[PDB]
Structures are given as structure tokens and as C-alpha cells.
């Protein structure tokens, strides 16, 4: 319980730093080819805002924790994870494109496929939620949740990697990170919530820093 609070504080600290860096990133000048990076960073900021709200709620709630509140993370995940899957698509397309493609042209063209990526993800979270609130056994949760995790990442792979080895490396790192959310689900209250507190730093905040550094690097090249 003390370690859940401690890791929450560490997570909130990293979130504050990353939020400030991200706001700064919005003002960095980019060539026409690179503007989609700012479009991505704005969506990451929106993810950060929802994450920050949950973590403020968490640190207040923990002060008087009289129940397993793990399930409340899903109110965050249900909103943030679909946005994070879209930013991944946008980045893959940015890497695959010669002319400065923007998210609007990707959305207009692929909205149906994007919907199916997010629908697969939703079913993963729904099954996970049923498991976390103990409406179904852990083994059925892992099985169902794992299937939709695999379905989501397969859909992302076959459409958007386009034999780009940079896309492959980002894909493998992201898949492993998301999979560890599945492994965390197997642990008791305290360990599981410490894991989620720190995994969120990697999946959300460190990913924001990556986009910030790429923006900085592309801005320097420009000038
Ligand atoms: C910022 C929050 C993120 C990226 C959350 C991702 C959550 C998951 C990848 C959850 C995965 C699960 C399984 C693979 C099976 C067990 C149930 C879940 C939902 C924990
Ligand atoms: C047991 C009490 C549960 C009440 C719900 C708590 C909500 C936690 C915050 C999650 C973040 C959601 C994003 C809000 C932005 C709109």
C-alpha cells in the first residue's frame, strides 16, 4: 500500500516533467514534411491530461483505500489506449511517407480500419475489466484479453509496418510493453498496482519524450 503510493508519486513527478516538455514541443518549428509529429504530440498531451486526472484521483483515494480500486484504471485506459494506437499508426505512416502526410488524410482514407483496431482494443479492455472486477475467472480473462491484444497488434502490423525496420523495432517494443499489462493482471493488488504505476511512465510519458526528441531533431535539421 505504501509502495503503491510511492510509485504513484514517482509517476506523477515524471508526468509533470513530460507535460511541460510536451507543451514546449507544440511551439517548436517544423518543415511541412514533419507537422504530423506535432499532431501526434497534441494527442499524447490529451492522453497525459486523462492519465494525470486518474493519478490525482488515485493519490487522494489511497489516503483511505478500503477496497481493490485497480478496476478504476480502465476508465483511463478506455479513453487513452485507442488514442495511443492512432498515434502509432500516424508515426508508422510518417516513417513510410516521402511527402508530409497529415493525420486528416490517414483518417479520411483508413477510418474503417482504425475503427476495427480500436474495437479489438475495446474488447481486450472489456474482458480485462470483467476479470479485474471478478465477474469472470483470471484464466478466461488472460485468454480473451491476450486474443484481442494479438488481434489489435496484428491489424496494426499488416497494414502500417510496410517492411520498415524502424516501424518493426517500435512495434516490438510497444507490443512487449502492452503485454506486461497482461502479466501485471496476474499479481496481487499491491504488486499489480505498483507495476501499472511504472508501466504508465513507459507507455505514455517516455513515448511523449521520444516524439519530443524526434520533433527537436527534425526542427534542428530544418534550421
Ligand atoms: C496507458 C495504458 C495502457 C497502454 C494500457 C494497456 C493495457 C493493456 C495492454 C491490458 C492488457 C490486458 C491483457 C493483455 C489481458 C489481461 C487483461 C488486460 C486488459 C490487463
Ligand atoms: C470508486 C470511485 C470511482 C469513481 C471514478 C473515478 C474516476 C477516475 C479518473 C479517471 C480518468 C478519466 C478521465 C477524465 C477526463 C474526462
From TrEMBL:
<protein>
    <submittedName>
        <fullName>Uncharacterized protein</fullName>
    </submittedName>
</protein>
<feature type="modified residue" description="N-formylmethionine">
    <location>
        <position position="1"/>
    </location>
</feature>
